[PDB]
């Protein structure tokens, strides 16, 4: 029941194409530990797989927030990156 334990749990899922339950843990880290910056990429590449497109971007959004606060450049520009291409789509 630990951040990166699940994480890292979420992680190995999406691998093996197990998108479900991938998000399911993903969606409940979020709300359970907020500052955690990893599972905002993931969740919102998934949203956009999930055709939940403006879903993904509002979660980009939440991670950007999280991200210069509590997180690393490297985090901070996946996110950004990722957020700027969803928008580029429609």
Known sequence: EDPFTRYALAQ????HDNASRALAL????VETDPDYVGTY?????????????????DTYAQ???????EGTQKDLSELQDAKLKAEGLE
Do not use: S, W
């Open 12 to 15: 190995e899922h999406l691998k």
């Open 26 to 29: 993903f969606e409940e880290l």
């Open 41 to 57: 990429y993931h969740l919102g590449k998934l949203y956009e797989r999930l055709d939940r497109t403006d879903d993904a971007i």
């Open 63 to 69: 991670g950007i927030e999280v991200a210069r606060e």
